[PDB]
Amino acid sequence: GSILHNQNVNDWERVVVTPTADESRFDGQIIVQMENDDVVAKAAANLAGKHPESSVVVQIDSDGNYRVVYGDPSKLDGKLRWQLVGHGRDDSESNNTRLSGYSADELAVKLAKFQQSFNQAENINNKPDHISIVGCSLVSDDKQKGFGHQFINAMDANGLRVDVSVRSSE
Amino acid sequence: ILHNQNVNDWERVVVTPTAESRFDGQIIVQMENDDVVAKAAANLAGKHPESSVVVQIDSDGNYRVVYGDPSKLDGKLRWQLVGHGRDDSESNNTRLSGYSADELAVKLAKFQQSFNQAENINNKPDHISIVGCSLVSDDKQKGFGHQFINAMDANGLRVDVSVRSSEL
Numbered sequence: 425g426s427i428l429h430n431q432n433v434n435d436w437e438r439v440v441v442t443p444t445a446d447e448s449r450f451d452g453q454i455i456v457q458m459e460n461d462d463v464v465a466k467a468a469a470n471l472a473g474k475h476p477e478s479s480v481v482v483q484i485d486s487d488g489n490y491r492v493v494y495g496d497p498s499k500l501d502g503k504l505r506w507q508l509v510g511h512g513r514d515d516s517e518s519n520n521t522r523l524s525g526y527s528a529d530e531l532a533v534k535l536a537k538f539q540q541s542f543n544q545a546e547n548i549n550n551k552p553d554h555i556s557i558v559g560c561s562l563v564s565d566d567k568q569k570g571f572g573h574q575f576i577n578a579m580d581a582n583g584l585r586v587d588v589s590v591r592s593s594e
Numbered sequence: 595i596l597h598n599q600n601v602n603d604w605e606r607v608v609v610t611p612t613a614e615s616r617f618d619g620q621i622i623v624q625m626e627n628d629d630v631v632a633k634a635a636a637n638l639a640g641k642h643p644e645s646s647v648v649v650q651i652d653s654d655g656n657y658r659v660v661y662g663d664p665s666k667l668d669g670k671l672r673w674q675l676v677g678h679g680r681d682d683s684e685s686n687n688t689r690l691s692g693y694s695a696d697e698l699a700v701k702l703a704k705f706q707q708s709f710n711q712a713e714n715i716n717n718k719p720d721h722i723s724i725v726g727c728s729l730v731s732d733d734k735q736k737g738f739g740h741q742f743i744n745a746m747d748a749n750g751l752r753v754d755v756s757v758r759s760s761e762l
């Protein structure tokens with residue numbers, strides 16, 4: 425996969441969010457961009473463009489610092505999903521895959537920490553019903569679902585119980 | 595009451611078109627004989643009326659096709675399981691149309707092989723949506739889908755699973 429840059433959120437590229445016509449059962453979503461890669465930043469922007477009125481895009485670095493780069497978190501309400509956007513890469517110390525440098529266990533811990541910090545600062549009280557993992561690298565179908573089922577358990581271990589889907593960015 | 599016996603006598607599904615998807619086709623699996631469930635299944639197929647197949651299946655694993663052409667299925671496939679979620683009086687033993695999560699997984703794995711003996715599609719589904727026509731709690735929904743994932747994944751059938759309510 426591509427080289428991993430997930431440091432120093434303030435420096436990150438921002439892609440223009442373009443609304444496109446081309447009706448979801450969620451009322452809002454947080455699109456969580458997890459590395460500073462142009463393909464990844466574009467896929468995050470495109471997801472928000474598909475639902476421009478109720479999408480918030482957050483970039484978050486390995487230190488846990490985040491920036492809202494699109495949308496209004498105050499407006500978030502109802503049934504929410506999260507879409508995580510990153511590159512899945514093979515690991516050399518296991519047969520597990522890593523999403524933007526995170527293992528499923530590390531990702532769940534990071535996301536639980538992010539949720540309380542983000543609900544803290546933004547002063548909103550809501551939790552995702554569903555989490556989508558949107559991989560911009562083409563890793564195999566098995567390792568995709570393997571990561572997802574690992575992630576479900578790890579999310580559960582961390583106090584957030586969610587449906588999870590894994591797919592490839594179009 | 596639960597009516598999941600004798601699929602030949604079930605109310606049938608009439609699908610009105612309605613207005614893509616990342617799935618190239620789907621099987622809507624109707625799990626009980628009930629007007630609300632039957633209407634929900636028809637509603638689902640109405641959203642993709644040219645690539646959706648509706649199947650009804652009883653408590654014996656016998657089934658029938660009531661909408662669409664199975665032989666035209668291929669590509670990335672979704673299954674949507676439609677029924678009424680009911681409480682067993684054991685907290686996270688919620689049952690969908692009489693089936694616990696384990697029994698649902700066994701049933702669906704048995705249906706796929708049985709279905710392929712006649713249609714010969716053998717296309718593993720990428721995704722399974724459980725569509726509950728009764729209001730079931732958020733935690734029970736997730737717990738149900740979680741057990742279902744585990745049974746499916748243990749049996750070699752690794753899929754994404756989501757659990758929701760239908761409109762009614």
Ligand SMILES: O=P(O)(O)O[C@H]1[C@H](OP(=O)(O)O)[C@@H](OP(=O)(O)O)[C@H](OP(=O)(O)O)[C@@H](OP(=O)(O)O)[C@H]1OP(=O)(O)O
Pocket residue numbers: 447448449554556588589591614615616617641723755756757758
């Ligand atoms: O609105 P629905 O008919 O219920 O189908 C949606 C929709 O799928 P399609 O529009 O492609 O048919 C979503 O697609 P997008 O939100 O990506 O545009 C998909 O969301 P995901 O891609 O995150 O999977 C989601 O699937 P799910 O929420 O189960 O993961 C699925 O809703 P259901 O399959 O649950 O009914």
Ligand code: NA
Pocket residue numbers: 615641
């Ligand atoms: Na759909």
